[PDB]
RNA sequence: GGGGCGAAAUGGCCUAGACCAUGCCCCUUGGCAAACCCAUUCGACCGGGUUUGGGUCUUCUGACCUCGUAGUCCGCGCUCAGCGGACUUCGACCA
């Protein structure tokens, strides 16, 4: 979570202190993961011995 | 610490060691307001392949102003800043007599009236 | 500043602290020519995750030569350089008696006549 | 609605590889703490509305109360108050 305010140029209240007009936020989530892959080749054979 | 007494003619000023370090010695004058006073920076090092040496001496003094005597609110504010640095490149294997003669010549050139006029009236040195 | 007196047998040498710093202490011997003299570098630090410590002690001394006694013109010039560093890796949680015994054994091995012969005659230690 | 993923649960492809189907991960922001008002057994009764909430001097730049955040030398002494104290910085309705 985070938060950052927003202030504009000399405006509102006929002031000039760069006052804050609003705020913008961002909510999220972080995650970690791991994985493994396996590859195998096999040769097959047959026979009708008699 | 380390105290240095300087005679201006009628009064004596005292500078106190503040930042005791080998590569940077900072002396500060203690009279009243510590901010915007007299400061001195000294540095000593070597050069190249242990041939000669290098000495640096800088002296700064910034004037301050205040309006609390008449105006009803003004903190002591600095005005201008003066920088007077130096550079000494004297080799170790030299000559004591030559170094003494050079120091005497530098002292004479400093105490002469030509540099004082060059500083005050901003007239180029040439009398 | 910090003075160290070393007794050679008939004369006493004085080493003066010059570069006072925590991670590097530089002691220099003051006898005559400052360039090409006796210098000592000391360092103390930690290691890993606050386990033990590390102490380094190096001693250097470069010989100088001069020809101004006979030849017209020759500045003092350094000849060779000798480096003798050390390394102390002693853990904090140890034993005072064991440390004292180790120091006594090191002192005995230094003061013995075998290391002196190994240094002088370059004969391998084995008597 | 806007995004994410092929990971992770399996199915096509399925030395390998990269894509697919259902399929699974989030947002629908939230909180102010005080003071006052109604009709009545002509207050006891829950619910609503208004004024304030770090604050002033020229809250224009910039400073004067306060603190929070750091970096730097720091005192092992000089000053009537004393003291442990210095300088530079960013923030200040709350998660």
From Swiss-Prot, chain A:
Coiled coil: none annotated. Signal peptide: none annotated. It is found in: Virion. The maturation protein is required for the typical attachment of the phage to the side of the bacterial F-pili. Binds to sequences located toward each end of the genome, hence circularizing it. The RNA genome-maturation protein A complex is released from the capsid upon host receptor binding. Maturation protein A enters the cell along with the viral RNA. Interacts with the host pilus. Belongs to the Leviviricetes maturation protein family. This is Maturation protein A. It comes from Pseudomonas phage PP7. The lineage of its organism: Viruses, Riboviria, Orthornavirae, Lenarviricota, Leviviricetes.
Swiss-Prot record, chains B, C:
Keywords: Capsid protein, Disulfide bond, RNA-binding, T=3 icosahedral capsid protein, Translation regulation, Virion. It is found in: Virion. One of its GO terms (biological process) is regulation of translation. Changing residue 60 to Y: Loss of translational repressor activity. The keyword Disulfide bond applies. InterPro entries: Phage_PP7_CP, Phage_RNA-type_capsid. It holds the Pfam family Phage_coat. Capsid protein self-assembles to form an icosahedral capsid with a T=3 symmetry, about 26 nm in diameter, and consisting of 89 capsid proteins dimers (178 capsid proteins). Involved in viral genome encapsidation through the interaction between a capsid protein dimer and the multiple packaging signals present in the RNA genome. This is Capsid protein. The lineage of its organism: Viruses, Riboviria, Orthornavirae, Lenarviricota, Leviviricetes.
């Amino acid at each position: 979570d985070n938060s950052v305010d927003v202030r504009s140029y000399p405006n509102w209240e006929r002031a000039a202190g760069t006052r804050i007009t609003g705020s913008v936020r961002t909510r999220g989530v972080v995650e970690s993961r791991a994985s493994v892959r396996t590859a195998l080749r096999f040769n097959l054979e047959t026979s009708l011995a008699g | 610490s380390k105290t240095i007494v300087l005679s201006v003619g009628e009064a004596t000023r005292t500078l106190t060691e503040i930042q005791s370090t080998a590569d940077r010695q900072i002396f500060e004058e203690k009279v009243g307001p510590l901010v915007g006073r007299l400061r001195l920076t000294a540095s000593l090092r070597q050069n190249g392949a242990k041939t000669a040496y290098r000495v640096n001496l800088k002296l700064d003094q910034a004037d301050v102003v205040d309006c609390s005597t008449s105006v009803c609110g003004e903190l002591p504010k600095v005005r201008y800043t003066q920088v007077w640095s130096h550079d000494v490149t004297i080799v170790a294997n030299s000559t004591e007599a030559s170094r003494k003669s050079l120091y005497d010549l530098t002292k004479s050139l400093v105490a002469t009236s030509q540099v004082e006029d060059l500083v005050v009236n901003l007239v180029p040195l040439g009398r």
